[PDB]
Design a protein around this ligand. Structure first.
Ligand code: HZJ
Ligand code: ZN
Length: 257
């Protein structure tokens, strides 16, 4: 199956998932000089005070923290969105070196990692239905640069030892995702897709302008995770990012001048 290697990586995905060559694939390069300021865009509304994290999991291509989405506890609204979107999970993409790792780029600049907070539109009732809809998901994308440590990230970093290999999971309660947000909520937005298979074109992307800083010691801990399952040959989980895709007939809008 698919992965990020030489023989099963992103350039191969179209063979099993033909939508990989589709009209609204993600990620994309954000050209800051051709993005259009849109004054009709609302501020983002992020209501994460009641979030309930459940588990942390190595799924073989990333690690993810899952949330209880059986009620409107942690929701995203406003911005370009109509309706209420519930937080399902967050995960990261990162590189083998500090100069790469993000999926989106800004004027071709790559960041060391990218945080994705995945939300789904409650009018479709469950996330499985939402992924079949052009406005089913909203993913909030946050860039990571290497510099000062991010204290709100350390609890994630400290548990990664216990989910080193594919399929391992651990309890991960009482994590507050508000500790991961930058100071500003200025954003770009464009209609896009999931960046791993099934690559469905169901995502409103909201990409924040302001990156968060994390320390070299925090990101090095990401790079010690494993693609393989326990007892298999050891392949470090690095460079789990899809390269930028053609923008085609799409405009990127900015919430800020
Ligand atoms: C498990 C699923 C398929 C994949 C998937 C899902 C959710 C969020 C995802 C985020 C991803 O990453 S990203 N960079 O934000 O786009 C990549 C894949 C994602 C669910 C949605 C229901 C599918 O399950 S299913 N087909 O109904 O059985
Ligand atoms: Zn992602």
């Amino acid at each position: 199956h698919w992965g990020y290697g030489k023989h099963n990586g992103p350039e191969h995905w179209h063979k099993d998932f033909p939508i990989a060559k589709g009209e609204r694939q993600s990620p994309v390069d954000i050209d800051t000089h051709t993005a259009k300021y849109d004054p009709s865009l609302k501020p983002l509304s992020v209501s994460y005070d009641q979030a309930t994290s459940l588990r942390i999991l190595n799924n073989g291509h990333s690690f993810q923290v899952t949330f209880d989405d059986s009620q409107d506890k942690a929701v995203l609204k406003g911005g370009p969105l109509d309706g209420t979107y519930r937080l399902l999970q967050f995960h990261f993409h990162w590189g083998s070196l500090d100069g790469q790792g993000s999926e989106h780029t800004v004027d071709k600049k790559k960041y060391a990692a990218e945080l994705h907070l995945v939300h789904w539109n409650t009018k479709y009732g469950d996330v499985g239905k939402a992924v079949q809809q052009p406005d089913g998901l909203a993913v909030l994308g946050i860039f990571l640069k290497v510099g000062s440590a991010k204290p709100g990230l350390q609890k994630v970093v400290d548990v990664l030892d216990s989910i080193k290999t594919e399929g391992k999971s651990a309890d991960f309660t009482n994590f507050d995702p508000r500790g991961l947000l930058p100071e500003s909520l200025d954003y770009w937005t464009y209609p896009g897709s999931l960046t791993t298979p099934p690559l469905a074109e169901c995502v409103t992307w909201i990409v924040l302008k302001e990156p968060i800083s994390v320390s070299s010691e925090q990101v090095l801990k990401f790079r010690k995770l494993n693609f393989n399952g326990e007892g298999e040959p050891e392949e470090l989980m690095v460079d789990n990012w899809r390269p930028a895709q053609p923008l085609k007939n799409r405009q990127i809008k900015a919430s800020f001048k």
